[PDB]
Design a protein around this ligand. Sequence first.
Ligand SMILES: O=C(O)CCCN1C[C@@H](C(=O)O)Oc2c(NC(=O)c3ccc(OCCCCOc4cccc(F)c4F)cc3F)cccc21
Ligand SMILES: CCCCCCCC/C=C\CCCCCCCC(=O)OC[C@H](O)CO
Length: 366
Amino acid sequence: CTIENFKREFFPIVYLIIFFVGVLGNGLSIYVFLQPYKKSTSVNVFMLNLAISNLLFISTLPFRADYYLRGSNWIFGDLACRIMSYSLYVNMYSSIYFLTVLSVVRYLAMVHTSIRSAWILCGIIWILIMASSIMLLDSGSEQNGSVTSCLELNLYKIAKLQTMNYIALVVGCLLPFFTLSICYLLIIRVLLKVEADLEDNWETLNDNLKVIEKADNAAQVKDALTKMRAAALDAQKATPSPEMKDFRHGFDILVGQIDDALKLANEGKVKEAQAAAEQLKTTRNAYIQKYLVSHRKALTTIIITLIIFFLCFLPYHTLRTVHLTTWKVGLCKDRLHKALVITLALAAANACFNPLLYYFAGENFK
Ligand SMILES: O=C(O)CCCN1C[C@@H](C(=O)O)Oc2c(NC(=O)c3ccc(OCCCCOc4cccc(F)c4F)cc3F)cccc21
Ligand SMILES: CCCCCCCC/C=C\CCCCCCCC(=O)OC[C@H](O)CO
């Protein structure tokens, strides 16, 4: 209608922006991932597969942009038109599954070879999405006079797409969204548990160390040290790997330094004990810094994935469903269709948004 003028103004800009930004980001990311120097992890296998999928998709965007810059004329042949749709949807649902499986893996890593397991999972995802999407290859370039069209909805496609939507809405969108959400809510829950317990024990340690600093005799210092050691042994038990070994070691040597101070408290030597207490405080602060940095990174990756997933996909799937259920052959539903165009652009922008995850979760080590 006049939706077409908006499409021909809007799609070229956003597609070219996604293309250049995404080539840059995904190229840097894949270059980093394929280097044999750094030790390979499973999350890197998932991120590599995701970057490769997004880059394959991004390579088709110049053709989409060309199509609209020509006033919605397709010049690239019937096979390329088929590949357009195939690559769009293969990328989209492979990306959703890569993110979701990465999330399940992280949750299980907190609760509970894995490199080969990640490669097998990614191969399964590739095969699933590519096999289940093959009927998109039946849709080709349609021609009306002198204007070969592509990328459009039409009656020839509708009967398929409508049903093909719902299944894809349930299995490719809502299921992974729910899985992602539940895994990350459970992770937030375990993090809040450990942080609450750690603050609780922190408070007892601060109180009894303040008592030790404000020392009156050898009995009160020993009493405060006994309380401290009790609180510290509670924390060591409720601790639930490089980061996990450092924490257990810190807890053990903290209990050791408290036993050192208690030895001094039996001898009635008050000054020695207070010096030991000060050095124990230094140790505790070191351990807390090391934990807090890890905590912040762990939450940042989770929230970024929820934001990207949410905003890129759920508006687009919602509006795509609504647009398909109301579609009439002759009716112009300009405003809804325009909304769908905007959210389709957001969904395509995922291929250049994902390198943020590669930023934060990727190089976070040291
Ligand atoms: O520009 C414009 O005017 C606006 C956009 C026009 N336009 C262009 C047109 C076009 O592409 O040319 O597409 C539409 C659709 N398409 C669907 O509604 C669809 C809906 C679903 C779907 O699924 C593919 C994958 C199937 C397998 O899914 C699985 C996923 C995960 C796990 C599994 F096991 C799966 F099996 C494909 C779809 F095209 C709906 C509404 C409009 C359009
Ligand atoms: C996750 C995605 C999985 C799938 C990824 C697929 C990647 C395909 C890349 C580029 C295809 C572009 C095809 C463009 C071919 C050029 C056609 C041409 O040059 O025209 C030929 C002739 O003029 C007319 O028959």
